[PDB]
Symmetry: T
Subunit: 106 residues, 12 copies
Amino acid sequence: ADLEDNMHTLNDNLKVIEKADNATTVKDALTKMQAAAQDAWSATPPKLEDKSPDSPEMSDFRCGFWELIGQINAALHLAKQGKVKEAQAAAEQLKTTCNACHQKYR
Amino acid sequence: ADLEDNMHTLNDNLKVIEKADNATTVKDALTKMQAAAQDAWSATPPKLEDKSPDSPEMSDFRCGFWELIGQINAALHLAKQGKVKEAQAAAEQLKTTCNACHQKYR
Amino acid sequence: ADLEDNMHTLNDNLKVIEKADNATTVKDALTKMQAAAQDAWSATPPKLEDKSPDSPEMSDFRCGFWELIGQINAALHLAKQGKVKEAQAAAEQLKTTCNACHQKYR
Amino acid sequence: ADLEDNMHTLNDNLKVIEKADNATTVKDALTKMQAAAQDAWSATPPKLEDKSPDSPEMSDFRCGFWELIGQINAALHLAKQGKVKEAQAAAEQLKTTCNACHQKYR
Amino acid sequence: ADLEDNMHTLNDNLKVIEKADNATTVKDALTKMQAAAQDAWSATPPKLEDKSPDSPEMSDFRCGFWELIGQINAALHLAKQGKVKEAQAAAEQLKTTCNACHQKYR
Amino acid sequence: ADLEDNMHTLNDNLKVIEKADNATTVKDALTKMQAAAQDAWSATPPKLEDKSPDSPEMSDFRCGFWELIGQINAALHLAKQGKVKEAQAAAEQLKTTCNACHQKYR
Amino acid sequence: ADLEDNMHTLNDNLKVIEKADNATTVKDALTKMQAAAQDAWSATPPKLEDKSPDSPEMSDFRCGFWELIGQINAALHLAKQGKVKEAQAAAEQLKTTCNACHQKYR
Amino acid sequence: ADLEDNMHTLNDNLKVIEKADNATTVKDALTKMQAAAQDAWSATPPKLEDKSPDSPEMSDFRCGFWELIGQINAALHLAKQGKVKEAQAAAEQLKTTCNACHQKYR
Amino acid sequence: ADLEDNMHTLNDNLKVIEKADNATTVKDALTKMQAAAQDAWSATPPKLEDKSPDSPEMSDFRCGFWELIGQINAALHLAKQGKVKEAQAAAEQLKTTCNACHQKYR
Amino acid sequence: ADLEDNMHTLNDNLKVIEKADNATTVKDALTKMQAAAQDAWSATPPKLEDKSPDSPEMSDFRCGFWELIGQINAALHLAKQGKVKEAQAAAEQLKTTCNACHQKYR
Amino acid sequence: ADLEDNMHTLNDNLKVIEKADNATTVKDALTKMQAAAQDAWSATPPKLEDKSPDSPEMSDFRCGFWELIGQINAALHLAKQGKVKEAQAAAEQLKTTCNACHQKYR
Amino acid sequence: ADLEDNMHTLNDNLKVIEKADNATTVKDALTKMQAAAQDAWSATPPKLEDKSPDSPEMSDFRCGFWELIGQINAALHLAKQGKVKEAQAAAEQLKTTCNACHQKYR
Ligand code: HEC
Ligand code: HEC
Ligand code: HEC
Ligand code: HEC
Ligand code: HEC
Ligand code: HEC
Ligand code: HEC
Ligand code: HEC
Ligand code: HEC
Ligand code: HEC
Ligand code: HEC
Ligand code: HEC
Ligand SMILES: [Fe+3]
Ligand SMILES: [Fe+3]
Ligand SMILES: [Fe+3]
Ligand SMILES: [Fe+3]
Ligand SMILES: [Zn+2]
Ligand SMILES: [Zn+2]
Ligand SMILES: [Zn+2]
Ligand SMILES: [Zn+2]
Ligand SMILES: [Zn+2]
Ligand SMILES: [Zn+2]
Ligand SMILES: [Zn+2]
Ligand SMILES: [Zn+2]
Ligand SMILES: [Zn+2]
Ligand SMILES: [Zn+2]
Ligand SMILES: [Zn+2]
Ligand SMILES: [Zn+2]
Ligand SMILES: [Zn+2]
Ligand SMILES: [Zn+2]
Ligand SMILES: [Zn+2]
Ligand SMILES: [Zn+2]
Ligand SMILES: [Zn+2]
Ligand SMILES: [Zn+2]
């Protein structure tokens, strides 16, 4: 998957997460996100095509995915316990990371 | 994944395939369509919910999926061989099986 | 397992599913049922031993089994989500499929 | 494997089946057929190159492989029990499906 | 599975074993009996709930189950060696174990 | 792990189970208790080293551990079914087992 | 393996352990002893065939085997920790178990 | 496991590692510690629940965990080589990392 | 593998990649660099041995590896797609991340 | 598979390879030749049945297979790299090892 | 296992195979023999410790082992087919290979 | 890997072997050699590019790798027992095979 494909995947499964009524739908959504983020953190966004890889921009970009992956895991921790409303809340809090990286680098 | 979830998956991956430039991307997108159609065949569409599980439209519905699952495999055969533009021509040709079921039951 | 033992398995797990009070017992009963039905779909029933493998009755006998596994998958989908009562109700609708085969071929 | 390769495989292992004197030779032959049929049912025969995939010809073609796979499984059921003569008989009965599809579509 | 479910499972496979005509079928019945006796040994029978788990009754009840699992393993030993009649005679013999626990705690 | 390590492990997970608010957390605590009780049953307590392994003390010490592993398995049965409160009441009950062995060999 | 085969296996690995000069070799000998003692505990010795499986003799015979498997597990514990001499002294000690059952049922 | 239970696990295995006399106990303690720290790196500590997921404190909290797993990997590297005392000494240096996090965030 | 062992691995595989003529060779060499960098991130370089595990140079060191591990994944993404000369241009570009860390800490 | 069974396999797959247009087909055919030659090396040809297992013709026979198994691996190396016409030139060159053994022992 | 223990294993399983009454005991004895012979083919016998690794005697010693595994594979091939007496007779021919090595090198 | 790549691998790990101070470093080095030799024995050296594959040169070349693989296994046998000095000695003795094949065919 390219970068855009993986963003589309995270976004879709985020929508599945809010629509869900049970923990298994949520669990499986989060796992697909977890795979899209893993495939994506090594990508280079078009806005950073002329930075060296070592620049603080590109390492802040990598930092955004690791923070994203951290809270995806936190949401999965809740889902695997059956706490559907608490997982949906945790998944909502994930958008702060989404937006922060979008403001700077998208 | 409910039925429309998996319909959305099929649609997204049709779009990934038409724009790809390698067989790896195409292969993986096909594999996801395979997963989606397997989760979808045992579902009752809304417009068929009041007709018996034996009825010929329920048989004709689940027959449509195995025809789809067939041509996905066929396309997947071409992609596993590196034949990327023929795997893409087979994915383009998947739409007439999509339309046929849609005209009848969507 | 022979055909008669698979049928007795299918029937055992309907009682299990109906008396169940949690989703784990239901998913496991529905999993054994999928096992018994997979093994039984290739069998030859006493009253069709007379007949050709490509006869209409044998093609229909087999096709009645593809529809039972279908509905068993749908009910497993609910049970995996923790919806025990929806799972119970979907399994009770399965007896439409048992009856339609029995009338023709038992 | 192309379609012809897989037909050659089924035919060879069918010959191995009649030559056999033990259940393991038979079991392993049937398993190779089972894989050739799986690889083959999504193929398009030259005689159906101009039918749409949804036509009753192509779905009857798919139907022939599923009936074939059903009795391969039945033969394997016998072989895995040690019943060598009964498996060889079941494997012989498979030729009806072979011939029926050959008459129409080969 | 509760205790009663696993008892019915033991019963069913005793019948399956007596009518079997090959070793594969007895082995699988013995395998399922083993899985049943393993889930059941830690359960509490209705007539021993009013009692501490370290009482000799709970100890003798668990003792009966390990006696049963040994006789199933011995029978499974013979079945894995193709001795259908010997394993069948062994399965019949362990009825003496089922009965011993029954006129005690059932 | 020595015997003392596994005792501390048993103790920790009893506390974890009493404060849990979901089934996933009790199941894992029970799973770890099982792994602990399995490593510990073949150990020799300090007050039974001066003794042959076939003495009734070593036999009753090992007897206590199999009593414990049964009660953990019964509790694990309820937890796997989502019955958090029942499994929690079951975990509390097996404290009677921990104490019985303790005022004997500790 | 019959009972006698597994006895010879126990004997061989006792000798292998006494002459070993490292932990890997004792661990594997203890592992094979474990596999031997597991296959053997459900067998019936020649001098206890004239007897019901719930007699104290069959119960004490099976009791001896669980005593043995515990001492092998304790020795395996030390070997996995690299304590060759301690595991070697532990293997020698369980000769007292082999002898106890022998002047009883052999 | 919650954050507090993972911390109690991390602390348990430091005592295990310090009192250990072989490399197998150390590698296994260090493996449990890696488990507890992996599960805890995505948690939210009481005193930061107030705060944004992309706040400096949460980014720092997470980053303090990447350094603890790092050092735990290094100590596992030694323990896997059988260097128990070097492994013990590397683990005792781990408390620099525990302290630096506790001062800021406990 | 100590730190210089894994540095040597990275260097050798950089040379394999520049001279390869297929993506399989490049893919596998990249996978080995992945393994090497995973074993290397948790190591303390000599010139940093006296600075605290918290120090910003230790953080800046282990940050450098994840930047390297990132671009290896990125190159590995291109190789898995068959893009051999672009996977090689990405491996050529890996050197500026090598130099950057070397100028600072080698 | 008896010896002539596996000879037939080798022959069929030589023909698949010469006509293929991709490395996937060639790879899989080579993998099947690998399986066939592994099953075939430990067989005694008819014209060598009365010569001792030590005899130099039995040694020279089983030496011929490892020479064949070698060049199959070598061809398989080229196919795994995508070099389809060089993998096919190596498969064409396999025949001189076939002929050499045939002239001597067929 | 050392060379002498592997030989004692090889000899143990010949007696097992000769006294066996079913194909399962034979296949399992022949499997242990293949294990012992695989581990022993790289050993150095007492009377060749004097000698070079590329000496004619060591090359011959090793080559005598490739022929023993060969014949053990052939006998396993029969035992896997349920031909216990043919398997027994093929194993009794194995002692030609044991003798030829012993005369030269024991 | 080409032939030269694999020779470089064996040589590197041989250097790691003499530098090592523990059995795990040695074990892992030998395993990487074992894989390089496996990948290499089917190769054709430049000096034998004009020999037929069946010539005694090319089969002596294959013979050199099998002797090499035999002693790599012997060294691994020692390493897996913890005998580091004895494994380093066995690994040193391997150079005779290296040199012998280098004199003739390199
Ligand atoms: C940086 C660390 C990011 C994080 C965290 C997330 N996204 Fe993102 N996103 C990012 C970039 C650099 C881009 C631009 C890609 C490009 O090719 O220009 C995007 C884009 C998207 C899109 C648009 C997809 C498309 O069709 O082009 C979507 C739908 C999207 N992003 C969604 C999304 C969600 C839901 C996230 C959190 C769960 C998220 N992104 C995080 C960079 C980063
Ligand atoms: C029957 C055998 C079908 C085949 C083959 C395909 N689709 Fe489908 N589709 C089907 C139904 C019954 C429905 C309605 C489902 C509902 O719950 O209302 C759909 C719907 C879609 C949608 C929209 C989903 C939504 O927004 O609710 C899409 C985008 C879609 N289908 C796409 C699609 C594609 C791309 C297919 C083949 C490649 C395809 N469908 C096949 C039934 C069937
Ligand atoms: C055909 C496609 C069938 C479907 C679907 C189901 N059943 Fe069936 N069943 C079928 C036949 C032809 C027979 C008779 C076979 C014979 O040898 O007589 C049966 C038998 C049963 C039985 C009695 C079995 C016995 O112990 O003798 C039962 C209890 C039974 N079947 C139950 C059952 C249930 C609950 C089903 C749906 C879940 C079901 N069957 C489906 C053919 C077919
Ligand atoms: C349809 C559902 C089929 C079934 C069932 C079987 N076969 Fe078939 N076969 C089929 C077709 C459409 C063709 C023509 C392929 C082509 O490229 O034109 C064939 C051909 C064969 C062949 C010839 C192989 C060749 O070298 O071209 C053989 C040997 C063959 N088929 C054998 C065979 C056997 C043994 C079957 C049952 C076990 C069998 N076929 C089933 C279609 C179908
Ligand atoms: C104790 C050590 C037992 C052994 C060994 C066997 N059985 Fe059992 N059985 C036992 C109890 C305590 C009960 C009552 C459980 C309850 O909840 O009431 C039973 C019951 C049965 C039943 C009746 C189930 C029903 O739904 O009516 C059957 C059919 C049964 N048991 C069968 C059975 C078989 C076949 C056994 C040996 C193979 C066997 N039991 C052993 C206690 C014990
Ligand atoms: C015997 C059959 C026992 C059972 C069941 C349980 N315990 Fe145990 N316990 C036992 C002994 C012989 C000892 C002494 C071991 C020694 O080496 O001295 C113990 C000790 C404990 C301890 C103290 C550990 C410490 O480091 O001080 C604890 C906390 C403990 N045991 C807990 C415990 C729990 C929670 C149990 C049930 C779930 C349990 N024990 C059962 C013997 C036996
Ligand atoms: C019962 C609880 C036993 C334990 C523990 C051990 N042995 Fe055993 N042994 C037992 C019996 C009933 C028999 C007779 C079996 C028969 O079929 O006659 C034996 C026999 C042996 C033998 C002789 C085998 C032969 O072929 O002659 C040996 C060498 C032997 N046993 C060894 C052995 C060892 C080494 C044990 C402990 C590690 C051991 N036995 C324990 C009963 C029991
Ligand atoms: C942050 C990155 C931390 C690291 C690294 C370590 N600890 Fe920690 N720990 C942290 C917090 C924020 C807290 C308090 C959480 C709360 O809910 O109050 C803790 C707590 C502990 C405790 C007490 C746990 C309890 O049972 O209440 C202990 C014993 C503890 N921590 C130990 C510990 C050790 C040994 C560490 C290094 C190996 C370590 N912690 C690292 C935050 C962080
Ligand atoms: C830090 C984040 C580094 C990155 C990225 C790379 N290297 Fe490295 N390298 C680093 C250090 C601290 C050292 C010194 C280690 C020591 O123990 O002294 C090295 C050393 C090397 C060496 C020589 C090793 C030796 O002979 O002792 C080589 C050949 C080397 N490094 C190569 C190399 C390559 C090819 C890299 C990227 C592709 C690379 N290094 C990255 C620290 C870091
Ligand atoms: C010895 C080292 C051999 C090598 C290399 C190959 N073959 Fe072989 N082949 C060999 C023998 C001893 C026999 C006779 C077996 C018998 O039981 O009579 C054969 C036979 C064949 C056959 C015909 C089999 C039959 O119909 O009975 C074929 C088609 C064949 N061989 C093909 C073949 C190919 C294609 C090879 C390399 C690619 C090859 N053989 C190698 C011995 C040896
Ligand atoms: C060389 C290639 C051999 C083959 C093939 C077989 N044996 Fe062997 N064996 C060989 C040697 C060099 C030795 C002596 C090693 C020593 O340290 O003295 C042996 C030894 C035995 C023994 C005695 C083992 C002992 O306990 O001391 C036995 C019982 C034995 N060998 C049996 C045996 C059998 C049955 C074989 C064929 C299946 C066989 N050996 C093959 C060398 C070789
Ligand atoms: C034949 C059976 C060989 C054995 C055993 C070993 N090596 Fe070798 N080596 C061999 C050949 C034919 C060649 C030439 C390759 C070429 O392309 O010309 C080599 C070469 C090497 C090299 C040089 C690598 C390079 O950069 O070209 C090295 C470092 C090497 N060989 C090392 C080596 C070691 C350490 C061995 C034993 C463990 C060993 N070789 C065995 C053939 C054979
Ligand atoms: Fe139909
Ligand atoms: Fe008792
Ligand atoms: Fe940072
Ligand atoms: Fe030779
Ligand atoms: Zn991707
Ligand atoms: Zn989408
Ligand atoms: Zn779904
Ligand atoms: Zn069956
Ligand atoms: Zn029943
Ligand atoms: Zn194919
Ligand atoms: Zn053929
Ligand atoms: Zn249960
Ligand atoms: Zn332990
Ligand atoms: Zn046995
Ligand atoms: Zn957790
Ligand atoms: Zn604790
Ligand atoms: Zn390392
Ligand atoms: Zn074969
Ligand atoms: Zn060994
Ligand atoms: Zn022996
Ligand atoms: Zn290679
Ligand atoms: Zn190198």
